[PDB]
Ligand binder design. Structure first.
Ligand SMILES: CC(C)(COP(=O)(O)OP(=O)(O)OC[C@H]1O[C@@H](n2cnc3c(N)ncnc32)[C@H](O)[C@@H]1OP(=O)(O)O)[C@@H](O)C(=O)NCCC(=O)NCCS
Ligand SMILES: CCCCCCCCCCCCCCCC(=O)O
Ligand SMILES: CCCCCCCCCCCCCCCC(=O)O
Lengths: 352, 352
């Protein structure tokens, strides 16, 4: 399997972090809590975010059911955008696609978003669908891996991943908890989309983007409370534990070594790191765990500062940032994600 | 890919269609519509269903969050039950599984169920997890078809599908409107797992089940409203068009014909039919359009009568029934499911 295109899309409204935070302490009911808000919004190392709605409008998003309706509607719009983008990048057409997968965690669609996306693009009635849901922040790297798995049974085939994540819209569930506030500091809105072709298909089509050689999942024992949704009348409420960072610190070198020893490669063999931006404490703990020098990760940081945490979408935006800055050809690349599980996923790549 | 193990798990308490009606007509807010209730409950051709919760508890099950957490607790239980049974039947062990696909439309689990089930039975930490939401009633055929798609490219592998539908628990979204009541008369609670194995590993574990040969998805354009959920503060409220049947009548034969030709076969080279029991009106419509004899779909008719509509999991029950009845060796079976999309999935099989 060979990546033929990468494209991200973002909502038209962008605000600076402090615009956001300025309006946000003035929100219904947050003014008792304004200091820990500013403190966290400020250590978050996000410089702006995209919002699928005008900033003005968020305090009137207290109904879950309205929020999710708007999610359906907005989410397709943007997934359609990034897929047109990647297919252009991949010089291809929707008629071409033999498998679509969608990944989200910030809304509940039925029919699922791929259904809606195929409907919109005039995808071939027989397209195989794969609506991945509860995967979270890991689904960017897991999606690429699921695609690879596909194009391994179906060489001559074309597969897309689309990821929409509209983290703003989850706002009916925000309370002034530390964990809700943390994500209030971190999350933004955006989509991304990855076209990839099986090995037979890559020549004919001229596939640009890199090879997808392998992936490994790593699921942690008794770690469900690390990341999750408390789902209810309020919608989708963050569970996000402090323990997350020290797990990484403790178990992450080993996921990497086990996955790279099967290739007889070392950390030193990675030409480019493609790593999910959990936010400052998560990037550090990565960088510390595998002891990377500040530049292996500069593009993940530069993504987090620019657009904030786009959940599963961020790792693909960032993948796109690396493909462009055009790495040492025939070198190795490692995608690295984690989400609800708790799990990690690693994706082995080789540039052109 | 070759099935090795199928298994349905089911909530301990079975209730009569009649005692379920006679209790349901006394539920807070229902006695006024007793008459339509009786009429839809008798009209449905379902003689008993299992419920996850005792019957008399459902009137108190008014909060989505309470329902959603009850779901997660019980769905895991029931899913690992299904799974372990399939494994046994395949004679394999939780550790041998190299990817678990997971299937629900009935609860919102993050971490996902596959995540949870995998901790429960201890699958390897690097099991490949494939969490499907939003395929709903088509998921039983859909999931078996992505099992093959996986195993095509992994001939030594083991992949499992685990379906769990706990329709009951949607009760907080239930109000006495017609589509909703139609729901209270068909849907029951249960779980199926399939254990599949790839082509070279079939020879080894000596895989008993049907060989999985092919799949055709078929997504009907502009039918996103025929069925799915209006998701809200109140939970998962069913959307179901009275138009659904009519589209099966119209568009099914061609879907079946286009697929068996590709294969050089006929409606009548089919050894056994495994159909989704969506409604007697559905089943008729399917038999009507395919101009099948009454025997073709008897196990479906009986599965409906015996444990209700179990959304995705129903077909996998009917598929275990079918295996059990042993259709003529080396003949061809056909899986046929329908659901939110609107779509159909066909799965071509070959019985031992
Ligand atoms: C309802 C059922 C039990 C049979 O019902 P029945 O009482 O013999 O006859 P009908 O289907 O005509 O239903 C009676 C009335 O309810 C209406 N109705 C039936 N299903 C309806 C729905 N899903 N939404 C709205 N109205 C519906 C009918 O239009 C009819 O109304 P009318 O008398 O006002 O014109 C059932 O078999 C059915 O029709 N369901 C469809 C199956 C389905 O959709 N599959 C589920 C997905 S797995
Ligand atoms: C401005 C609104 C953002 C504040 C609310 C944060 C909502 C996003 C939190 C979920 C992030 C998605 C992935 C994280 C883990 C998960 O729950 O799956
Ligand atoms: C006392 C018993 C009540 C039983 C449940 C009544 C409401 C059932 C709602 C069923 C929804 C079925 C959804 C799945 C199939 C689909 O969406 O594909």
């Amino acid at each position: 399997s060979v990546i033929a295109g990468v494209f991200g899309a973002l909502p038209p409204h962008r605000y600076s972090q402090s615009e956001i935070t300025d309006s946000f302490v003035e929100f219904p009911g947050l003014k008792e809590h304004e200091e820990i808000i500013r403190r966290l919004h400020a250590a978050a190392k996000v410089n702006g975010r995209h919002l699928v709605l005008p900033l003005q409008q968020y305090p009137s998003l207290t109904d879950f059911g309205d929020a999710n309706e708007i999610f359906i509607e907005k989410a397709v719009d943007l997934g359609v955008e990034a897929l047109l983008g990647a297919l252009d990048d991949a010089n291809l057409r929707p008629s071409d696609i033999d498998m679509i997968a969608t990944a989200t965690v910030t809304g509940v669609a039925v029919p699922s978003l791929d259904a809606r996306i195929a409907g919109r693009l005039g995808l071939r009635p027989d397209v195989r669908r794969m609506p991945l849901f509860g995967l979270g922040s890991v689904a960017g790297a897991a999606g690429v891996a699921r695609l690879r798995d596909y194009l391994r049974g179906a060489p001559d085939d074309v597969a897309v991943l689309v990821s929409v994540e509209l983290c703003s819209l989850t706002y009916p569930a925000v309370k002034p908890t530390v964990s809700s506030l943390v994500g209030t500091a971190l999350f933004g809105d955006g989509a991304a989309a990855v076209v990839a072709v099986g090995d037979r298909r890559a020549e004919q089509v001229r596939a640009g983007g890199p090879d997808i050689l392998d992936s490994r999942s790593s699921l942690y024992p008794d770690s469900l409370h690390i990341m999750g949704w408390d789902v209810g009348s309020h919608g989708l409420r963050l569970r996000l534990s402090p323990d997350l960072t020290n797990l990484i610190e403790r178990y992450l070198a080993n996921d990497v070594t086990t996955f790279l020893d099967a290739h007889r490669l070392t950390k030193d063999d990675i030409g480019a790191w493609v790593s999910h931006p959990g936010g400052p404490k998560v990037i550090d703990a990565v960088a510390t765990s595998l002891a990377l020098p500040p530049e292996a990760l500069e593009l993940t940081w530069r993504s987090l500062g620019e657009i904030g945490n786009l959940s599963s979408a961020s790792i693909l935006h960032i993948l796109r940032d690396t493909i462009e800055k055009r790495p040492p050809s025939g070198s190795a690349g490692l995608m690295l994600a984690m989400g609800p599980g708790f799990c990690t996923e690693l994706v082995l790549l080789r540039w052109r």
